[PDB]
Amino acid sequence: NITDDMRGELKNCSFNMTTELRDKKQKVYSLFYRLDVVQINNK
Amino acid sequence: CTRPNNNTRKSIRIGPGQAFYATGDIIGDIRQAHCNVSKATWNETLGKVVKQL
C-alpha cells in the first residue's frame, strides 16, 4: 500500500524449479522474507 | 503477540513425490507483527525486581 510503511520485507521471487518430472522444469514463484535471502554478488 | 496476515500456502509439487509448502499470497491487515504488553504491569514488576537488586 503506497507509499511504504511495511518496508516490503518480502520479495516476489521466481525461479526455474525442478519438478516431479525430472527433465522439464517449471518457472514458479514464492514470497520470501529478506531475512532469509541475500543478494548474490530484477536482481 | 499477533501476526495479522491471512496468507495462503501455494504448495508446489517439487517432487518426485515429496511436496514443498511455498508462500502463496499475503492479504488482510498489512501491519508489522508485534506484541502487546501491559505497561503499568511491567513498570510495577520491574520495580519489584529493582528492590532485590
Place this chain on the structure above:
Amino acid sequence: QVQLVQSGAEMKMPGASVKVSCKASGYTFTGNYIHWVRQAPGQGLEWMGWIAPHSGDTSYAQRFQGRVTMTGDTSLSTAYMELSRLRSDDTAVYYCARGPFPNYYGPGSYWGGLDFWGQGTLVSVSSEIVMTQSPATLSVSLGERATLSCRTSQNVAYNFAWYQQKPGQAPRLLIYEASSRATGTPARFSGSGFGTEFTLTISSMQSEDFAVYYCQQYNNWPSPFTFGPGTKVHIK
C-alpha cells in the same frame, strides 16, 4: 488494482425495499471491513453500517439496524446490502467502500475511513442532514490556492477525512485523520483543524483537481460517520 463493482439502479416509494450487491477484486476480500454508505440527491453522504467479512461482525447505524441486512459471500468476493421499508432517508446513490490499511500509530477504528469506493448504485424514494461546508463553489484558475472549510454540528476524534469526486465516478480518498495524506495523493493537498471546524488546502491547483470535495467524520460506531454538503472546485 483494488476495485469494487456494484449492482443496478431502482426507483421506490416510501414503504418499499431494495437489495444491492458489491463485488471486490484486487485484494483479499475477507481482509477488509466493508462500509455501506449512501448519497441522496441534493444531499450529502450517509453511513448505513459495515460488515467485517472475516469475523462476520457488523455495526449498524441506529437508524438502520432494524431494517437492514448485510451479508457477505466470501467465495464470491461479494458483499450484499438489503434495506426494507424505505423512507425518505433511503434514497440516494448507494456505495460500498472498503476500509483502509491498518496504521502504525492508530487507535481502534482509526482506519475506519472509506479507502476505496464503488461507483455507487441509484435508488430513489423521498429525503435527510449534519456538517456544513463553504464555500459552495470555488472558482479558480490553475495555479491558485484553494482552501475549503467544514463546520461540524459535533466535535471530532480527529477522525476527519476528505474525499474527491468527479460525478459519475467513484469517490476517492484525499486526506485521512484530519491531516494524513492518502497514498498516491500529492503534496499539493494538505488538511488540518479541530473541534467543529476543519479545512483542506491545495497549494497549487492542477487541472485534474477540479471535482467536488466532501468532508467526513468517521469512528467505530453507528452514528459516528457524518459527511458535509460538498464544495465544488470549478475551473475559471
